Amino acid sequence: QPDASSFPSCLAGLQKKAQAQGISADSYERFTSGLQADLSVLDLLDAQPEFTTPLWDYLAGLVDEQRVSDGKAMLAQHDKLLDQVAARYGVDKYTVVAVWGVESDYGRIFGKRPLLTSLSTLSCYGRRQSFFQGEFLATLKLLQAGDIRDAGITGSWAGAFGHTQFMPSTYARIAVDFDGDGRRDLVGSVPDALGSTANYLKKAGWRTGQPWGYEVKVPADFPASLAGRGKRQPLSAWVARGVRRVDGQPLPGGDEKAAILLPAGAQGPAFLVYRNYDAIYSYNAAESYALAIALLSDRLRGGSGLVASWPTDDPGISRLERKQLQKALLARGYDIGEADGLIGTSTRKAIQAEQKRLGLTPADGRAGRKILEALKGAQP
Ligand SMILES: [Ca+2]
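Above are the sequence and the calcium ion SMILES. Below is the predicted complex in structure-token form.
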């Protein structure tokens, strides 16, 4: 089993590796002095989840009306900067602000855990030590360079942090100094953050002026077997198969490769995705985040949102509504923690108990509209 007694020898070993890669002993002592193993970070790894979260729950929180209103506020406030970012990297401002909204809520996301604690612990314990050692050493190089200046910086357990939720190795490779002050500051500089977001997408293959894709309508008998991010066909093949834009307009046709996504079955919402969707997808390597960015970018361009409905009687609910649901559960005597809007195991267990009590099916523990409307009390 992991034991805290091994941590000092592990940290001392990493000092020699750090020195070999140009991190000074002074830097290493300054940034790692009083680091302690936090073995609780391993509780979040190779943890089998008890609950399944469908795509429409991710989208209800990532693309909620507050995310859309906040994004339109940022497009207004940062208009001139965003034009300069688009001019310098060839990525449109709606895409850049959509990524900023989904990844960090425009730089407002609470980092639960100190970066250097998570990464040093994961460098010394568990089954991914070599990977996390690279991330740990990349963080120390960024601190030595003064790109990062807060050794107590917080982020995800896996080391994603700042406006962009880059991991340290991504930060090293992709971060830009947009404002030209000699610092690549993705924590405190909105210019550096938006420029780095754009640079990430450019490096991932973004084609200037091309769409991510769009929502489409497929015919009743469209074969679900043809769908998937990996299964591209020329647009002419999709036209031949009766695929159309959701407003009935034809596709462009010709020879450009595109995939159809049917994340919720042959008559659920359908998406035609181009190479720029693949660039977006690379940021989180998860359809939930990739379609959140694409659909938020559609809302920020003044789109009304998804035309098709998800196959549920229980639509997802906003971040504000998740807080209302958590307050409702606390009011009914479920000790689920703070009403922070994060739907974790404690909340989902209380939802499932209420679903079974109320005869709601499925008793899936989802934070959906059905349980919200059932449990809301006074002044939600
Ligand atoms: Ca800068």
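The radius of gyration is 23 Å.
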